[model samples]
Structure formats: C-alpha cells, structure tokens
Target: AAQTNAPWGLARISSTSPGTSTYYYDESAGQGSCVYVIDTGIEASHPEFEGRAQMVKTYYYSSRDGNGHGTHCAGTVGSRTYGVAKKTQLFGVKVLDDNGSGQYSTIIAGMDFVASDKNNRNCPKGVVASLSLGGGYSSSVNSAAARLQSSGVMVAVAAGNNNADARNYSPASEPSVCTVGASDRYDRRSSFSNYGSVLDIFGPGTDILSTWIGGSTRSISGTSMATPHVAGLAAYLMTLGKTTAASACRYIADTANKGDLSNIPFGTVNLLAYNNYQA
Candidate 1:
C-alpha cells in the first residue's frame, strides 16, 4: 500500500504544522532513487525513520547536539512526511555537532569526503548531496563547488537568513550549486528569507515541524528548515527518473508554481509542468 492514504484529498503534511507537506502518489513520477545528506547526524531511533534508515557513513562535528540544532535539521530531512524520500539512504555527516555550528575546516573535510566519493565513483547510483550550512560567498566556495559539479555531485545549499539578497552567502551563492530560499505556508517568500541572484528555488522554511533530540518533535524556522524541502524535492525528482542533479533541479523548477516569480535577480530558474512521462 502507498504510504499516504489520507481522506481529506490526501493531505501530505510538511514537517511542521502551519506548514507545507508535498504529496507523492505511488503513481506520481520523479527520479525516485537514492540520495545522501551531509549534515548534522540523525537521531537514529526516530519512528519517522528507523527500519527504513540506511547510513553509508556518519560524521559528527562541533560536539553532538549540546545545543540541539543539528538534530532538528536532521529530523527535518529524515523525519517521515517532512522528508519526501524517507525511504532513501540519508548519510549523516555531522560537520556541526549539536550546537548548529561548526568550523570551516570541518565543512571542507565533509565536502572533501563527498568530492572523493564522486572521484572514486564508489558512491551508490542516483546519489544527490544536500548541505544546509554555509557562510557568506567566497571564491574558495565557488571553486570547490565547481569541482563538485565536475565530479557529478549536485550540491544544494541554503540562502542564509539575512532577509537581504541571498548572493551574500558562500557556496549557496555559487553558480555551480542549487541555492534554496525560504517560503511560508502561503508559498510566498518568508519575510526573513534572503533573496537575490543566488536564490535558486523556494521551499518550506517557516515554522517547520520536525523531530528533535531526545526522540521528540517540534517546530522551527529559518532558511535551514527550507533547505530540506528542496533536498526532499530533489530526492523525489530522483524517484521520478531525473537521475542527475541537473535533471532533479529541472524537475523542481519545472513543477514549481510558475508565474511572475520565475525570474531571479541573477537570472531565471525554470519551474516545470508535471510530466508523467518522466516517471
């Protein structure tokens, strides 16, 4: 049986209340496949994701959710409804311990691991990498992103919550990566969400409900929350047959609500019409 059998037109809840949860029918199409998330470690025992969990690698930075932020982020990515591809393998590379903070060297190390995986071609098939953390834009981040792109790994980043232009952020602002912004329950850009040329696409990032440390759940907000929405969307795209990161990104842009908002300050990001054939 399909995971969602709700009667109210089948409401697929987002990770939080007053939130957005996308639906995927068994017949729905996407590149429904495997993906790896290099973020804070997951709470391994959460019901939303337990028996279905698969971790090829794990990295912990900072110290272990002493502050409880990374765990929240992980829950958003693997916690059932909030996570579009809950069944997919989620690689928890904890570059930032529980405080939701980590050093640049740690981040570089994690990225290096992913880049090495891309170089060796030893990673599982249909792998898409999602990272929710980054600093302001930098030449080094751009160069590293290009290297990742060349290695065939699609990196997704968060357009930091500056409420200004998103281009200020490193990595996320890099043209080689998919930079994500935050949208509210109404689907409008969150008041605090950073916009501008770097904002590639918008996803649920406000008051999001998700699992937290100590095997609990709660609602949180920020571009951090929105990052996983696109991450999940990317995974969903994989299941629909959009094998590559570029293809998954195309599916997201193609399926987004296209209107006067398609154009970004840098350029335009395409929203696609749902295509069953792509399934």
Candidate 2:
C-alpha cells in the first residue's frame, strides 16, 4: 500500500488528500532511484533526512551547507516528511559554497562527477539531478546537463528568480533540462518566478517549509524552492519505469495540471501534477 504522510504541496500535486479517491496511492517513493541535489550540500544528519542522505561530491565548502539552500532543496526533493519521493537515495553534490555562490565551471565539474560511477554504489536506471542554483547563461552548463541527459540522468533546473525571460539563463534554457518556475498555493505564478517559453513547468515555491541546516526547518520563497518539487516528481517517475530523461520530462509535461495558470504561454507553463506513480 502507498503511504499517506505526504506534505501539503505533494498532496496537492498528486490530488491525494486524506479522504480523496487517490489518497495513499503514491506507491513510487523513488524506491530505487537516485536524486542528486546539485547545490550547497545537505545536512545528512538532519532528522528529516537521517539515514537516507549522503554527500557524494563537494565542489565547494567541503559538502557542508553553511548557506542552507542546498539542504532545504534536498529536503523538498526527498526528505521522509517534506519530499515528493521520500525513499529515494538523496545524494548531495555541493556546487555552491558557504555564501551561496559558485562558478559555472564548478557546476559543470559537479555534473561530470555525478555522471560517473566512481563511488562504487550504482544507481538504478536513471538519475534525477536537481539544481536549485542559477547564474548567467553558460554553454558549458547547458552542454553538461545535455550530456548527462544522454546518459540517462534527468536534469531539473530552476528558471531563476529574476522575473525575466528564462531563455537568458544557463541550465533553465538548456534544451534537455526540465526548467521549473515557481507558483504559490493559490495556483498563481510567483511574483519572482522567471517566465518564458523555455520554462517547462511551475511548482509550489512560496513560503515552502522544508529542512534546513543545523537540523532545523525554514520557510523559503523563490524559483529555487520550486525546482526541487519538480525534481522530486522526476524521481518518482523514474521509479515508475520511466528509465530515460526524455520519458520523464514527457510524462510530466503531458500530465501537468494546465487549468490553474492564467498567464502567457499557458500550456508551456503547466503546473506540476502527478496522476499515477506506477507502471
């Protein structure tokens, strides 16, 4: 039987509230899939994550999240209580430092490191790479994500918080990535969420409560908060036998809840929704 302890955002997207017809039907908690949070690193010892999280690579800050952004994003991606895929192997690849800043080259290096099987533990089928950080457009980052996609890694990136065209950003405009924008609980676009035809989906980002550094929790708002929601859903799809990056993105785009947003490029910015989790 599927578990019913999902958070509010997760429940809303799955349409499986406590008394609803689809309640507890989310069987794919990313059981065998791996979700790599490419950010400032995670607090693996945090109570919410506990035993299921690890730091696989550290491009900066030695894999410790002094900035807290990485842990928050990771929690949303796969913490037992706040995540969309609670059981996924949540690995952190620290591309940002204590100050929440890093180079695009570092991000590229992190992506390359994740694509390798150097850590001995092999992830099953595909990998979901969740990136909640962003900067100016970098061909290197775009190409890196594309290469990983070709290798069966699904890349989910933030559309940036600048409220501008996502096409002006790096991984957000990357063709192989699932570019995610932010929305609020009201099913309206977040004021800071970037928009453009390049954005593929929108997710809950305003005041989202999740794990933080020092084993605490915080409510943050940004497209960064939204990215992990889609990334977690990607991990869920991977466990449901969607073994490739393209397949996962296709399923999300096709099944997204399109009736909520009343904005430009309606279909392109469809809200993230999950109808089923099993093959």
Candidate 3:
C-alpha cells in the first residue's frame, strides 16, 4: 500500500540530477524526531497522516484548523505519501486564528513553548519547528525565535513572498533561524519568492501538492510552502544523530546541491536542499 512515483519536489531532493520522477529515501529517516507546525491549526483527521500527526498545543479554544494553510504545510513535512520525513511526529502549535492571522505576541508564545519543551527533554531525538508565516521586522519575535535554535530546536522560517530582499523580513532575517527561499519544478526561483543573503537554502515551493483540509489534497505555492521541506529534512537529520540545531544546519548547508538551481537572485544563497537519500 505504499505510495508510488513522486511529487516533483520530493523527486528533485532525492536525486542528484533532475527529471528522475521517482522519490527514494532511507526508510527510517524520521523515526525518532518531532516537527512542530507553528501556523494555523492542523486538521487532525486527514487520512494522509497515518495517525502520526496530532495537535499538541493551541492558542484557540479548539486546535481544529479553519484556514487550510497549516495543514498543507504539515502534509509536506510528514504526510505518508507526500512527506519528506515520512515518519516524523507532527505537533501543531496553533498561533494564528481562523482567518489565518494573529498577533505577533501569540506567535512568539508558540516558539517559547517549543524552546521550553525541547529544553525539558520532550523531544528525545531532536525538534524542528516549521514557521510558514511572517511579516515586518520585530526584535522581540526575532529574539524569541532565535532562542529556540539556541535551545537546540531547529527552526525553519519562510523568507516571505514579497519578491524583495529577505533582509526586510522578521524571523527570516534572524541569523539563527534557518531562513528558506523557494524553487520550482524546473529549478527556477519562484517569481514571487523573496531573495537575499539572509536565506540559508531553497526548497521546492511552486504548485506543491500536499494534504488539505476535509481529508483531501491540494496544490499551493509560496515560501511558506517551502520552509516545511527544510523542516522535514531537519527531522531526518535528527534521526541521523545531527541532534543539535547548528549541526543540522551545517550538514544541510554543506551537502546541499550548489549551482544546480537556475534564476537565483543577486544575494540568495543558491543552495537547494538535499537529503542525500539514495535511489
């Protein structure tokens, strides 16, 4: 009953060259790791989850997702058929409201919980927090997010969709956070994706198909969609004994495919995420 073929993004990361069209990975890559979805709540009943996904923390009365963005990002991080770290445990840290908007204070609160939890030995194999939302610069939020990585929780954040330099964004510009940009099927940067020296890596973001609300699937695009790919990779790295945030970031940066993507902007890192999964 295993899934067959591959989504272009997964296939691209698993292969050294493009156009293979098949996704391959180590079977136990995500077994011992945990990933936190810091966005809108997640729809826990989705069939793609295989029961590994759950809502662990929430700012709302219920953890059920009204807006579909967080669920989609979680699917890309760990859904059985579409996930990068297929066995990783998913914990939804709801910080946004039903309308997919919320105060920055709430968002920092979610990151704070993640930092505290990891420090308390809650995630044995390591923890990854995926943030697919962002806005203007805020020192308080940036410092809160930076503290997470310092506490040994790897944090991946979107580089924004402004198509401008990423340095202008909040957590994305934070040095400790793993800021991510977006590339497409043809290895081209998404036109709407932000760029700049702030980005640590790029992930497939264009027309990405993943689990959706109401037990279904949908295709969406944005740097928001791209960050969870790196978060999943970070989870896989945890299983490989890269338990510290810095080690995981170093491994990802060093092993990433260089000069392989096209249309990189002026100051972008020009590194595309690679899991080193062999066929």
Candidate 4:
C-alpha cells in the first residue's frame, strides 16, 4: 500500500509500507504520546501486538461487534509494527452501538469519556482523537470540535463516505477537525469517499488489510478504514515534532499525493505533490 515516490516513505522511515506497518517510527520514542480511537473494540489477540497495545479505557454505546467497524479502525491505529503508531496507547469508545449508528449526543458522550481520561495512565495529557463516523453536517458539532481543540485535544474525523459534494456530515465538517477521506492502493479516491473543501487529507480506505472480529483478518473498504490511516500518521507526526493536531493535519494534507479526482467533489484539495512543506 506504499506509493512509489511516496512522501511518507521519505519523511517517515519504514520497514513495511505506509498502510501495512503497525509501527510508524515515532521519532519521539512515544514520549507523552497517546491516541484515543473513537471506534469499536480491537481484536485483542492481534499478532502485531503481543503486549504492546493497552486499551486503558473501554466503553460501548452499542451492545457488541455488530459490524466490526470499530475493531478494524482500532487495529489500524494501535496494532504493533503493523500499525502507524505501534507504541501509542489506545482508548476505545464505542459510540456506534450494534446498529452501526448512534446519535450525536451518544457520540459526544463517548468523546467525553475519552476527554476525561482521568483514570488511564496510558492516555496522554493531550491526545489526538481518531474518529471515523458521522451523519448530516451540524453546527453544534463544529462548536464542540472548536471547544475540544481549545482544550488541547485534537480531533480527526472521517469525511463521510457519501460521495457527494453539495453536502457533507458533521464532525468532518467541523473546522479544526482533521477531516479525512479515502484513497485506494492506486492513490485514487474511492468511489464512496465523500469529498468537499472540508476534506483535510486522504488515506488508504479500499480493501485495507486489518484485524476483524471472531478471530479473523480481512481487507476492509470504507471511510472508516481511511480515518485511522490519518489517525496513525497523525500520531506519527506528533512524534516527529508535529505535536499539535492542527500541525499534523496540515502536515498530512501538505504531504499527501493528489489522486484521480474527476469524480471528486469540487473544492476538495488532494495532496497534489509531496515535500511542499517539511516537518
């Protein structure tokens, strides 16, 4: 899943490809580093993680792994040398219940659980939140995101996979939220990827290989898969001196490669070139 001449390859040293590596060299040695995955639970037995990952906190708005959305996203963010930030600890917040959907208030409550982080030592002082879900755009969510940003907790939300232009969903539409979209192995926008001016970065979201529930593994395709790639890379950026979420957002967007966008909605900015700016 590594693109040739990929800027990520140059800026971030790796033994495996960008999407495949569980361990993105956290140049900072995981110091004060923490990433909260606002998704479902992880497949606790993932090989890439023997003992490296710790789910310091866990909550569920849903009953169980109905669709396995959260589990896959969590693996992309926290699984070992296979994930982008292997050493970064993860806190799981199950906002989407078994129905694969949840209300805004429920999602916000899950976020509150993560933001409070008073009991988990593994949770960082200022954690970058990795979220990959949303519905219709909302002004209230934008205001909430601004508040969270001011609190020093960075947010990364999925550009809804609606593949529409005129409208996008909240959390992603919220300014200060690092809105992420999906790209295929060829670096082309997935047909399902929602796009707009609000999209901040692109990541591998098609057939992305990750852990699954029932003790199995497979490729997942969607905006959910794309979210954590940015999340992991954001965590990677944090270690390489891009401490703030805003900086990480800019870094990934500035560093991503432009993909096939004939289908992309107007106003969406793809990573047209790499090394436009340095970390």
| lDDT tens readout by residue for model 2, 118-200 | 34566674578888988888888889988877776788889999988988898888977788888776667888889988877
Better of 2 and 3 by TM-score: 3
Candidate 4 per-residue lDDT, tens place, 65-164, comes to 5567776787777564335565676666666666576778867776767656733555453477888888887777666766666666768888777787
Q: Lowest-scoring 10 consecutive residues by lDDT in candidate 3?
A: 115-124
How many steric clashes between backbone atoms does each model show?
Answer: 28, 0, 0, 11
TM-score of model 3 vs. true structure = 0.95
Q: What is the C-alpha lDDT profile of model 3 across 161-186, one tens digit per residue?
A: 99999887888889888999999998
Provide the overall lDDT of each model, using Cα atoms, as 2-decimal numbers.
0.59, 0.79, 0.87, 0.63
How many clashing residue pairs are found in candidate 4?
11
Task: Point out where model 4 deviates above 4 Å.
Answer: 1-32, 54-66, 118-126, 258-263, 272-279
Report the C-alpha lDDT of model 1 over 1-279, residue by residue, as the tens digit: 144432111122222222223343444312234445666666655676665444345455232444455556655555565454555655556676555676776677777777675444333445667777878767776677667656666677788888777677777778767788776654456677778765667766777777677878778788887776666666555665555666666556655655433223345342212222211
Cα error, candidate 4, residue 232 (Å): 0.6
Ranking by TM-score: 3, 2, 4, 1
Which candidate ranks first by lDDT, i.e. highest? 3
Cα RMSD, each candidate: 4.8, 2.9, 1.7, 4.9
lDDT at 209, model 3: 93
Instruction: Give the worst 10-residue stretch by lDDT in candidate 4.
Output: 7-16
TM-score of 4: 0.79
